[PDB]
Amino acid sequence: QQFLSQFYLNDQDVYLTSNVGGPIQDENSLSAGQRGATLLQDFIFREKIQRFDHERVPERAVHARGTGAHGTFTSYGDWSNLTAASFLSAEGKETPMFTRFSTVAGSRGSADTARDVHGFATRFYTDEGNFDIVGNNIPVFFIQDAILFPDLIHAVKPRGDNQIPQAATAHDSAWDFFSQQPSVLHTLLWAMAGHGIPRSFRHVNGFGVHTFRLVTDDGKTKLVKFHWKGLQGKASFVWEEAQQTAGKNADFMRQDLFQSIQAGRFPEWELGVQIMQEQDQLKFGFDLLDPTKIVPEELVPVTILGKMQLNRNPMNYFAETEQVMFQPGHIVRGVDFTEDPLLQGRLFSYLDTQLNRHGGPNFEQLPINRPRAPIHNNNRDGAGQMFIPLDPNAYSPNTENKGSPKQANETVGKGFFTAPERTASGKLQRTLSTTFENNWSQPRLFWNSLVNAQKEFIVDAMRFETSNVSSSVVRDDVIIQLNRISDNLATRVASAIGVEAPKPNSSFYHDNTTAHIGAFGEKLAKLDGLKVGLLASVNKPASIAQGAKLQVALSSVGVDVVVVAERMANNVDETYSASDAVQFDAVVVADGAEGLFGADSFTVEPSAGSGASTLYPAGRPLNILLDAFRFGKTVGALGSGSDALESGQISSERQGVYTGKNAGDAFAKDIKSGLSTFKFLDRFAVDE
Amino acid sequence: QQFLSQFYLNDQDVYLTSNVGGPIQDENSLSAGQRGATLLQDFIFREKIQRFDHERVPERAVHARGTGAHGTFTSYGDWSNLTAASFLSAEGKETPMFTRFSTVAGSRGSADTARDVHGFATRFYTDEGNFDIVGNNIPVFFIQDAILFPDLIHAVKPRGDNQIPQAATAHDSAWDFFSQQPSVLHTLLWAMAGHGIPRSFRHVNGFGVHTFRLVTDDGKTKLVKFHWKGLQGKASFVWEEAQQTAGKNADFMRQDLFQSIQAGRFPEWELGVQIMQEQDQLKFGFDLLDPTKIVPEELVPVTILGKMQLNRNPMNYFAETEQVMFQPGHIVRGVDFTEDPLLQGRLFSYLDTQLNRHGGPNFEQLPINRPRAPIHNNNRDGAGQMFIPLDPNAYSPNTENKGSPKQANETVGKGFFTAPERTASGKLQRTLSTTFENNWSQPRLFWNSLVNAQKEFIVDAMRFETSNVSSSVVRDDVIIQLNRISDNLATRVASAIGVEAPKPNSSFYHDNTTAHIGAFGEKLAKLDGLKVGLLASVNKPASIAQGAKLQVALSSVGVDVVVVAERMANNVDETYSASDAVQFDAVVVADGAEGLFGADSFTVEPSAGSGASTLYPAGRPLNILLDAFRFGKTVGALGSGSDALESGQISSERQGVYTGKNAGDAFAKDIKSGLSTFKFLDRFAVDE
Amino acid sequence: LQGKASFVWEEAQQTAGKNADFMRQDLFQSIQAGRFPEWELGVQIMQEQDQLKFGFDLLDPTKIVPEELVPVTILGKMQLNRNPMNYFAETEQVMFQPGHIVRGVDFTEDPLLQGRLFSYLDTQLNRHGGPNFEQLPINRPRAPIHNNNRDGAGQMFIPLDPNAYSPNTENKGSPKQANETVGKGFFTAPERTASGKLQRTLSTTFENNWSQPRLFWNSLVNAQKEFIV
Ligand code: HDD
Numbered sequence A, B: 001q002q003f004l005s006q007f008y009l010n011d012q013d014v015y016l017t018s019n020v021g022g023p024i025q026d027e028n029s030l031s032a033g034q035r036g037a038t039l040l041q042d043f044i045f046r047e048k049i050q051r052f053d054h055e056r057v058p059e060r061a062v063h064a065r066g067t068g069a070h071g072t073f074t075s076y077g078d079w080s081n082l083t084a085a086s087f088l089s090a091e092g093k094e095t096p097m098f099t100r101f102s103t104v105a106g107s108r109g110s111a112d113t114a115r116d117v118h119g120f121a122t123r124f125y126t127d128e129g130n131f132d133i134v135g136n137n138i139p140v141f142f143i144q145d146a147i148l149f150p151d152l153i154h155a156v157k158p159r160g161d162n163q164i165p166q167a168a169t170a171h172d173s174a175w176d177f178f179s180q181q182p183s184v185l186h187t188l189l190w191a192m193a194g195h196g197i198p199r200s201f202r203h204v205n206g207f208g209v210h211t212f213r214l215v216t217d218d219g220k221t222k223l224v225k226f227h228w229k230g231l232q233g234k235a236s237f238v239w240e241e242a243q244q245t246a247g248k249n250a251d252f253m254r255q256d257l258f259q260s261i262q263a264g265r266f267p268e269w270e271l272g273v274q275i276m277q278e279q280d281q282l283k284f285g286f287d288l289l290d291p292t293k294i295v296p297e298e299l300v301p302v303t304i305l306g307k308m309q310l311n312r313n314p315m316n317y318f319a320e321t322e323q324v325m326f327q328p329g330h331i332v333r334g335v336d337f338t339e340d341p342l343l344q345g346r347l348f349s350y351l352d353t354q355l356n357r358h359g360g361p362n363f364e365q366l367p368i369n370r371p372r373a374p375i376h377n378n379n380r381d382g383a384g385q386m387f388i389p390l391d392p393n394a395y396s397p398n399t400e401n402k403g404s405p406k407q408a409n410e411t412v413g414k415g416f417f418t419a420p421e422r423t424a425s426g427k428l429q430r431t432l433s434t435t436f437e438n439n440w441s442q443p444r445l446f447w448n449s450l451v452n453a454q455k456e457f458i459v460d461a462m463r464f465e466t467s468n469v470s471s472s473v474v475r476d477d478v479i480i481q482l483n484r485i486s487d488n489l490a491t492r493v494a495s496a497i498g499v500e501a502p503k504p505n506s507s508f509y510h511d512n513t514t515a516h517i518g519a520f521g522e523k524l525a526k527l528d529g530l531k532v533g534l535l536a537s538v539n540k541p542a543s544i545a546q547g548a549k550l551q552v553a554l555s556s557v558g559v560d561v562v563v564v565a566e567r568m569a570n571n572v573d574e575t576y577s578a579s580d581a582v583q584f585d586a587v588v589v590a591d592g593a594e595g596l597f598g599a600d601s602f603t604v605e606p607s608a609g610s611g612a613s614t615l616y617p618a619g620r621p622l623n624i625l626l627d628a629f630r631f632g633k634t635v636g637a638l639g640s641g642s643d644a645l646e647s648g649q650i651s652s653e654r655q656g657v658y659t660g661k662n663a664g665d666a667f668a669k670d671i672k673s674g675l676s677t678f679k680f681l682d683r684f685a686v687d688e
Numbered sequence C: 001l002q003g004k005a006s007f008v009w010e011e012a013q014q015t016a017g018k019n020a021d022f023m024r025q026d027l028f029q030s031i032q033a034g035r036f037p038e039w040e041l042g043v044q045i046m047q048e049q050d051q052l053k054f055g056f057d058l059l060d061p062t063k064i065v066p067e068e069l070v071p072v073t074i075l076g077k078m079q080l081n082r083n084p085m086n087y088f089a090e091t092e093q094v095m096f097q098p099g100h101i102v103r104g105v106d107f108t109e110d111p112l113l114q115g116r117l118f119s120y121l122d123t124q125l126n127r128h129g130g131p132n133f134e135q136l137p138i139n140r141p142r143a144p145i146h147n148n149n150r151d152g153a154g155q156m157f158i159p160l161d162p163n164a165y166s167p168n169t170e171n172k173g174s175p176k177q178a179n180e181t182v183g184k185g186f187f188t189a190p191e192r193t194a195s196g197k198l199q200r201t202l203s204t205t206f207e208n209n210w211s212q213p214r215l216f217w218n219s220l221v222n223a224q225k226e227f228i229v
């Protein structure tokens, strides 16, 4: 914060000024008399409204919806035998970071919990330049050449005529593109699985996707995949739950991150690489240059390099988060590119697109984009030039400035250098590499590797999405492509959408698996920032008191207890009116609250003598309980609170339903076990 | 579609070209060899990606989320004794229009069904220039001077540090502003009523808000308020239903408008004016220049001038809807401004802000912004100059171009002119007019005029919103202000939010009313575009066949029947998985579908012998039925389908619950009655 | 076709003081008077195998090919015959690019040409302030435009196809791909090849900076040698 603080404007206990330091008032326009017309000479009015009129900048062309935080990276070692990268040169070396997380398709103001691929962009402000890894929460991408990006994005984004639907692939054009371009199938399966709808940005992993090169000072190279291994654990929603969240809290994930950092529950990821040789490019049975392929961890383990912690929220969202401009071209000595055609073309786009966002060429001068290293070059001028270059002779080679700035290369001045043994060979061509042609084996690998419930979630997602596809041609084409992955997958989807069950095509069928690839099936490592909703009643103060008692039992694992009641009273956090199942990771009915959960509460006539509350909609408490159960959450009841379970026809013998006499350690232990499991998969039907 | 068709690009059965007409292919980057790096000389790659990189423009600073349609205005008379405006000069005279509807606060991907004021912007492409009325669905606005706009908007928009919450006033800053600036109270009550959450853009009225002047050729004036009286009827949601819609269909209102127009169900509004004299400005006990005040129709009736019909969807949303640039400064001869300080400052803002959106001065040259009248002036150059001016002598007065273009004024060339008797008098000042100081009497008028259920909806909205306000100071200030409107209102809100009930402050209390001002209490005029969801089962084909039978009986009133079943089969429109109560204005259980509605369906363990379906989430059918009932919708059941009502504990004795033996005329009659009532308000509890 | 004519320095200076617009005036007036200036387009035609055999590199833009070695073959004639109606709209806004290339022409590996291709597409964003500069009247083609490019500030067209992607079935596979064999598409010369290490180097073939300057010097009349001096 030492660096960014020089740009801070503090407006505590001060008089209002114009942008040029003249004290002003800004509450009334200058008029000709009491009820007269506004005067043109009112410069106070015009400066204020002009700033307002011009507040907005274009949203990012993709990843418009996102949030950011500051953090710090610590290297676990001296990695100089692997890479010349300065930030990895010493055990314990620390580097400031900024990270932005995002969805892909939706505009500004679209819901956090849309089903989508998610961005995971991390900047290291190194002493040898800014280094950005611009990644995703899924290790593979839809397409194999950057030139196809506008096609993919035009297909996924809303229709050109009416701009429907927002932040959704559940329309004809998306599935038309997916079925015409089978390279998309691997990423599609990841997005239709739990990875498309994570619980929070703290509960995902990150991936660089592309194979990169690491390069030593003497020019030796390794090929690597970058991994950000999350230390909280993977947690994901089911679709109906993600939808309800979009309606109740569009800001769910950004709120989760902000609040976690404010509470000192700093999320962490370890940076890892799968280290491979130049000679490994084809020998695994797929091309390392193909961004639709993973390298299974069974073939190449992840070597951990260091740890990122996110530990500070922005002071001003627009200045920091909205204006941060990442680029894969922000590369440092010790890293180099590969010939992955998706990566290759990305390099062009991120430099060009900042001209759109910033409106001029000097976007690297924005505080959030500036390096924490000296800038010395002969670049000059441009709109919004915030520096004053002292050298009036901005050219090389020069004698007029005694030959400075001096050229830096492999051997002098620690210059960037392209890996010296990289070579080109062959005819100039516009072709799809013959090595890129297997679009189906890895999707099948992913499919095989999932627990039954997550296979069902993929099926259910595809049934939902393709039932919204009007074109019979598209529906049929989708089933043909899915069938090349798995005849089981294809048949299960086909049955919902009026397409005839296809015959097996066994070309790519196999039974191989890779470990723990799904979003479901593992317990959480940390419970930090999960929320238990305690459903209480102001009419029974003892029910409210159970909140504090449960909180004390759960405070050591970083879980918050939220007390919900009919109205704000002492020790009540939220009202039933303002509450929903989707706000909580677990729901517990307090002792004495059971009267609010009558089985007839949904439909009873709210007549005068009926006693029904106006403080919340009919059936709200029971709705929260039943939604929590149906969505697969931990459900509990204390004392006579268990009568509410009876009202909702929820049997306590079911997994992830817990009862206890009072909020003691025994009950808290059960709740922690439930929260660790996170979602109880036995509440979801699976195809027979 | 004569005029705009000159700008159409038709891409049917053609070869791909660059932007300069060279045929190209665009599916593979040019590489050095099969697996080589991408070449800089690939201009095809770069032109394609550059267009993509620059697709986005800044969203509108307010009303970013909106939708548009083309239409036509027809004058009902020769209004030349009232105004010189050409578009009103003859009975039957027709004028093309473009109209955009919007919310205010949310960014461009935010949900249609957020609670907000709504925009209602209408352009007339008249034969004497573009004339825009840039209005709202509410006749009063929050603030009394345009200089306060950035304050209001910064307060209602998301927090500066974290950009939370999206498209919502349910946070501290918004209520801080409302309570510090009591002028906001009138609009606040409208927005907290049904008018904040309308069913569609077809079911709202429009208002110009400000007093304007109409001016005849000889300089005589009247003061007017503009009205757009909707011919469909007012229909609005309840809050819990609006939230659910935001999660299921962010595009609900834009989809409704698009589909209605495609179906030939063209929505209509009548343009009306309240006609007043210059001498009436202060006569009614408030100032006509005060945009927080209505003129009750009991005092001045609405004179109907003509009719707008929306009858054509855009061909390309971005080109037409996103790029349309409305301005109150688009005024024509026969109309003039008033000294309303809100209107006065607006004029500056709309000219200035288009420079942000368009990136340059020539925004009036965009096809959607072009006039349908001649352009002849000495304006020149600017980025994006799409014309070639033949006159090289662009100044007045001139002899070099023989004195052309010639000045047009009141008496020659039909020039615009300011109303000739307008005067200024008094000291230049930055003050609040003493005539603007009553912030409370009219909110009380509005409050008095609502049906009991809508009073409750306001209370429930304020309870919801202010329970999300953390500051005790803000919560208390809110109650103090509400108490000056009505002690009943203030007391009912205070009880939910932990504020002591205030004692009456009767300064502005009164019992006056104005008729039909609420969103609730009147039957719909037309049922066009309303939807009946028929819940059927593929296992009982006769259930599905009831759809066609019900449809034939409802066709004549423009109501669609949507057949919902477990899977896509013949005559099935959508699946249970893809369905929700919020999609339908009425829900009917078909004869033979009753087996899907088991009372234990929410919580039953999906064992093999339970025979639970994987085709939809647990309890989906019953959930649709129960939600429909709780939200106040028409519910129905045919034959044995009535068993489903019993499972859901819905008594057929309740209003808006209809049973029928079969899908005949007798049943359609009941459904028509239910749909015209639209919402059954006896299902909502009211404070005693 | 008019012939070469040049000033002496002291004369060029005096002209700058008396008429800053001398050359633009000359052109405008000549066209107005119907004295249309003309140039013949010619090419020196060489083989792929000729790249190094003349004693310098054809990829080196600091070298001429003397007409004694390769004659100029005349292809056609340009005549300039109409002044703009509005200087700003036409002349100021015209945005040239070497990347405006057509089927039948291709690039070479001249590193000056190679990098130019980037600059002229990028720099129009500065001048026009947005991506739709090819829509200015002076920049529009006299051929149909059909593609899936969309939006951008200053979008002057209304694309009717709401499905702007390839491959598609929703628009029946149109616009269709054009290449060497179908639809008269642009194509890169098919026998061009790449070989060698990726590198940031000055080609060893580019190293003679002095022989051709001497050729030029030798070839001038005495007075023009003096003018250089
Ligand atoms: C050639 C087009 C192209 C392609 C093929 C990709 N991207 Fe990209 N991406 C852009 C073009 C782009 C962009 C248009 O340049 C954006 C929009 C805003 C920006 O700064 O860059 C961007 C933004 C963007 C962001 C948001 C950065 C932020 O938070 O501000 C992320 C996380 C990614 N991309 C990630 C990826 C991944 C992991 C890719 C495949 C492995 C990928 N993109 C392929």
Ligand code: HDD
Residues within 6 Å of the ligand: A049, A053, B060, B061, B062, B063, B066, B100, B101, B102, B118, B119, B120, B121, B134, B135, B136, B141, B145, B146, B147, B149, B208, B209, B210, B291, B324, B325, B326, B342, B345, B346, B349, B350, B351, B353, B354
């Ligand atoms: C001085 C600032 C200011 C104030 C006091 C107002 N507006 Fe405004 N409004 C703008 C400044 C603005 C703007 C920033 O200029 C916008 C954003 C985009 C644009 O074209 O104008 C705009 C947009 C905008 C739109 C959207 C037009 C469209 O669909 O593109 C509507 C419907 C309104 N306004 C309506 C109103 C009403 C009914 C007002 C009060 C009676 C009002 N505004 C006061």
Ligand SMILES: *[C@@H]1O[C@H](CO)[C@@H](O)[C@H](O)[C@H]1NC(C)=O
Residues within 6 Å of the ligand: A078, A079, A080, A081
């Ligand atoms: C690098 O490799 C050398 C030789 O294998 C080894 O002795 C040295 O310890 C390594 N350096 C580090 C920092 O690991």
Ligand SMILES: *[C@@H]1O[C@H](CO)[C@@H](O)[C@H](O)[C@H]1NC(C)=O
Residues within 6 Å of the ligand: A407, A409, A410, A411, A412
């Ligand atoms: C780097 O620059 C130095 C000094 O100018 C030069 O001698 C050397 O050849 C360069 N090194 C490499 C590896 O290109």
Ligand SMILES: *[C@@H]1O[C@H](CO)[C@@H](O)[C@H](O)[C@H]1NC(C)=O
Residues within 6 Å of the ligand: A285, A509, A510, A511, A512
């Ligand atoms: C698994 O993968 C290996 C290596 O590619 C392959 O040889 C083997 O046949 C596969 N086995 C199965 C179970 O299909």
Ligand SMILES: *[C@@H]1O[C@H](CO)[C@@H](O)[C@H](O)[C@H]1NC(C)=O
Residues within 6 Å of the ligand: B078, B079, B080, B081
């Ligand atoms: C306008 O009023 C004049 C004078 O009273 C009269 O000629 C006529 O009735 C009116 N004309 C129109 C346009 O109705």
Ligand SMILES: *[C@@H]1O[C@H](CO)[C@@H](O)[C@H](O)[C@H]1NC(C)=O
Residues within 6 Å of the ligand: B409, B410, B411, B412
């Ligand atoms: C309008 O212009 C005409 C022609 O110059 C002039 O005679 C007349 O007085 C002008 N002013 C008004 C107010 O009509």
Ligand SMILES: *[C@@H]1O[C@H](CO)[C@@H](O)[C@H](O)[C@H]1NC(C)=O
Residues within 6 Å of the ligand: C177, C179, C180, C181, C182
């Ligand atoms: C051009 O496209 C056609 C039709 O798609 C294809 O068959 C052919 O291989 C392509 N021609 C060349 C020379 O690449």
Ligand SMILES: [Ca+2]
Residues within 6 Å of the ligand: A145, A341, A430, A431, A432, A433, B028, B029, B031, B034
């Ligand atoms: Ca290729």
Ligand SMILES: [Ca+2]
Residues within 6 Å of the ligand: A627
């Ligand atoms: Ca629900």
Ligand SMILES: [Ca+2]
Residues within 6 Å of the ligand: A652, A653, A654, A655, A656, A657, A658
């Ligand atoms: Ca249990």
Ligand SMILES: [Ca+2]
Residues within 6 Å of the ligand: A028, A029, A031, A034, B145, B341, B430, B431, B432, B433
């Ligand atoms: Ca004033």
Ligand SMILES: [Ca+2]
Residues within 6 Å of the ligand: B652, B653, B654, B655, B656, B657, B658
């Ligand atoms: Ca009834």
Ligand SMILES: [Ca+2]
Residues within 6 Å of the ligand: A359, B359, C129
């Ligand atoms: Ca600009």
Ligand SMILES: [Ca+2]
Residues within 6 Å of the ligand: C111, C200, C201, C202, C203
């Ligand atoms: Ca070189």
